Design an enzyme around this catalytic site. Structure first.
Site, PDB file in Angstrom:
ATOM      1  N   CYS B 234       0.803  -1.213   0.000  1.00  0.00           N
ATOM      2  CA  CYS B 234       0.000   0.000   0.000  1.00  0.00           C
ATOM      3  C   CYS B 234       0.839   1.267   0.000  1.00  0.00           C
ATOM      4  O   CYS B 234       0.297   2.353  -0.221  1.00  0.00           O
ATOM      5  CB  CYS B 234      -0.927   0.019   1.219  1.00  0.00           C
ATOM      6  SG  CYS B 234      -1.861  -1.494   1.472  1.00  0.00           S
ATOM      7  N   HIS B 290      -0.119  13.182  -7.914  1.00  0.00           N
ATOM      8  CA  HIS B 290      -0.932  14.423  -7.803  1.00  0.00           C
ATOM      9  C   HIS B 290      -2.388  14.185  -8.222  1.00  0.00           C
ATOM     10  O   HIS B 290      -3.239  15.021  -7.857  1.00  0.00           O
ATOM     11  CB  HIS B 290      -0.285  15.558  -8.608  1.00  0.00           C
ATOM     12  CG  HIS B 290      -0.395  16.896  -7.957  1.00  0.00           C
ATOM     13  ND1 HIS B 290      -1.544  17.660  -8.031  1.00  0.00           N
ATOM     14  CD2 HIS B 290       0.487  17.609  -7.223  1.00  0.00           C
ATOM     15  CE1 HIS B 290      -1.364  18.786  -7.370  1.00  0.00           C
ATOM     16  NE2 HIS B 290      -0.125  18.778  -6.863  1.00  0.00           N
ATOM     17  N   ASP B 294      -3.456  15.980  -3.331  1.00  0.00           N
ATOM     18  CA  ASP B 294      -3.038  17.328  -3.664  1.00  0.00           C
ATOM     19  C   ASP B 294      -1.943  17.772  -2.701  1.00  0.00           C
ATOM     20  O   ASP B 294      -1.585  17.064  -1.758  1.00  0.00           O
ATOM     21  CB  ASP B 294      -4.230  18.286  -3.636  1.00  0.00           C
ATOM     22  CG  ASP B 294      -4.974  18.248  -2.325  1.00  0.00           C
ATOM     23  OD1 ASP B 294      -5.148  17.140  -1.778  1.00  0.00           O
ATOM     24  OD2 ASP B 294      -5.384  19.323  -1.840  1.00  0.00           O
TER      25      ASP B 294
END
Lengths: 317, 317, 317
Positions: B234, B290, B294
């Site tokens: 992960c 991105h 953010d």
């Protein structure tokens, strides 16, 4: 009744109305058992059909109360206490009588041994103050008491020394090694000390435990302490440090085998190897049953607690 | 084959004999896939019946190998590299080709943003040295590296910000919020960096994780790294602090959304409010996709990691 | 519609009543475009005649809504994310999808280069605190953030180096040297970072800019951010210093050619020539398109910003 350990409890009053519907888990009936009166929660939601129980009833266990819709020792000293002055022969309440009987059984049947110790909790107190600040400017509405760190330390010590998470039988011949870790924490209600039990302390974090403790302390000091929140304890923590007693030797809370009493933290000099640094020592005292545990195991247990609370980072290892 | 993510893997050799019986979970067959060659473990114990696989075979997934008994851009610059000197046109290995293709896909398809940060780990390093001493004089045979604390900090940060424990699809329109927390840790084998995955880092303790890491680091540096020990990650932690690079901007390890690169710890002055105390700052760098995250979420994530590693006691809260 | 750059926007709801009359410039209709939903202002005052638009409509540009009266890369890693634990496949919102597509275009089509720097803003911070006090005891109801000084510094730098106030075409062959100086400032709304644009920053003063910023920050964090207040930006300032990240490498906000990321101010020692004075350094980072700007021009630009913010008096020269 959802959960009573098997004692016949006498009802005090009910919380509902004919036609009212009750929420998920809220008060329906208060019953005055041992320790303190307990408010039975709700099992589910639904409007009232039965007042199968009333005000003044009595239930021993699993009774349908609601249906819904959706050798030769000397005797005690016989003294005429009134010949020296004025007396007032008050009679002990039923919870006081029951607690006295329980303590007079634990005193006889349990050989107590009390190991005292002092834990350097300067770093722990600094960290607790820092987290109480940080949990304020982030609007968590939680207050982290010094007792949740002790609950975590005792849960760790019960993980390491599982002999302390035990219980003896009536005859004292068969142990019961428990694998779960629940810890009762003696809360001071106007009606004495009641011990609510917190479950699976070994897993929960300090903020979850602190929320649980902040809730149940008020739940007890008000009297709304629900059953199951005082049953199935593997250990007891009696914290009287808010009042004094630099040390004290508690009584083992049967059927457990140990109890950790906590005293008032004091700033004492500690030898760092070359000088006396002022540290903040917290006096703890492990009073345990000698039949299960011996002096050396009690020593190792209280030193595990001392090491854990001395450097709380040992809770992540 | 017990666990391959669905890639066609070419066998290298086998580990058994006709008549031999294999243990619970040990080597039977080495297969040369991506990253590094993996040794299939045993599912159970039993003597050999089939050499259904041989030396040089190839399996894509779930094949019975054993039975037992019990727009228009410019082209690359065409240069005659030999007119300036002597060259040697070596050809990249298959794992190097595959890793190059994977990185050239991650570079294009992922908009990377890299947030650098520095974490005050003086207390963490003191505590790690203390626990390495204490785990020696108590004969645990464990070495606690500074990477397991970072694994715990990143697991905590993934608990707090579950958006970082995600994964995008081929088209980049559907997220996959994972609820488990596995963390790959880039180990440096003689054949480059391989990423073995440690499962459920959020639950395991630092000593269990340290044993896992000490085992799998050697398992990788030797080449015996078993499949499933490099799948289902992960998050990624690429620690190159043993070599230098006060900072570096790693590449997101698809299909994950972030990667934490760790640099060399250095003793730097830190403003305590009135003077410069010499602390030990560890430079971390979160490079993230991105499209999912953010700049502000990356900032909060890396500051959660910075706070956790700055005071490791926040792992118990 | 008064001002949409030419994207087809889907209405969410309207603000008016049949018979109501609207003020000079206030909300009439909210439309959910890119970045965030925008409230169309009023062009004039007058009572309602047409519900030419309704709730759920869609307008691409200039539609009458109201009348009044007065090569071959590897695919994404196919992984069964559920075989390692429990997942939850949430789907990205439309603004998240659009922002992901925009960032995945800017990453590929723009060769980014990021120059980091640190600016001595001790004098600037002292002056900002002094002006925040003076603007309080004089009842101006304005709060001067450290971002308006950076907007002024970047406007000065765009005046001095007009190559940074540019924009490339689709093919990247024709530049567009802009003569105006508008600056977007990444504000953090609950729905991510939205970039509202402030116009003619080179002319306006710091108090007018501070009022504009204090208004539009709230306008964005509430969602009432009007179109035209997010269009026509020549530069971007992404300030994440309130959260951490001692440095970070932002992504150029196409069709611009540069972006200035701002990090957390920290008190660091600075060599005054004979000793280390504790100054307050603010880490900035200019990430720019390499096709328009080269490393040297980026260096000169970020050092112009560094000099301006180091001694803000250079804004009057």
């Amino acid at each position: 009744v959802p959960d009573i350990g098997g004692d016949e409890v006498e009802v005090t009053e009910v919380m509902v109305k004919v036609g009212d519907k009750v929420a998920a888990e809220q008060s329906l009936i208060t019953v005055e058992g041992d320790k303190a009166s307990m408010e039975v929660p709700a099992p589910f939601a639904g409007v009232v059909k039965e007042l199968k129980v009333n005000v003044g009833d009595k239930v021993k266990t699993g009774s349908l109360i609601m249906i819904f819709e959706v050798p030769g020792m000397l005797p005690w000293p016989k003294v005429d206490f009134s010949k020296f002055g004025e007396i007032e022969e008050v009679e002990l309440g039923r919870i006081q009588k029951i607690s006295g009987a329980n303590l007079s059984r634990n005193w006889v049947m349990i050989p107590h041994v009390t190991h005292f110790d002092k834990t350097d909790i300067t770093e722990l107190e600094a960290f607790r103050k820092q987290q109480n600040e940080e949990a304020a400017k982030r609007k968590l509405d939680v207050k982290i008491t010094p007792v949740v760190f002790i609950m975590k330390a005792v849960a760790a010590a019960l993980e390491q020394m599982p002999r302390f998470n035990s219980s003896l039988s009536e005859d004292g011949q068969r142990l019961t090694l428990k694998k779960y870790i629940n810890i009762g924490v003696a809360v001071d209600t106007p009606n004495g000390l009641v011990v609510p039990v917190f479950k699976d302390v070994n897993k929960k974090g300090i903020i979850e435990l602190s929320r649980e403790l902040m809730t149940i302390s008020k739940k007890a000091r008000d009297g709304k302490l629900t059953a199951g929140e005082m049953q199935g304890g593997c250990f007891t923590i009696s914290s009287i440090g808010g009042l004094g007693t630099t040390h004290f030797a508690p009584i083992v809370n049967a059927p457990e085998v140990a109890i950790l009493g906590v005293s008032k933290s004091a700033m004492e000099p500690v030898w760092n190897g070359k000088e006396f640094v002022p540290r903040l020592m917290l006096p703890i005292s492990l009073s345990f049953d000698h039949r299960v545990i011996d002096g050396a195991d009690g020593a190792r247990f209280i030193t595990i607690i001392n090491n854990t609370l001395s450097d709380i980072r040992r809770l992540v290892m």
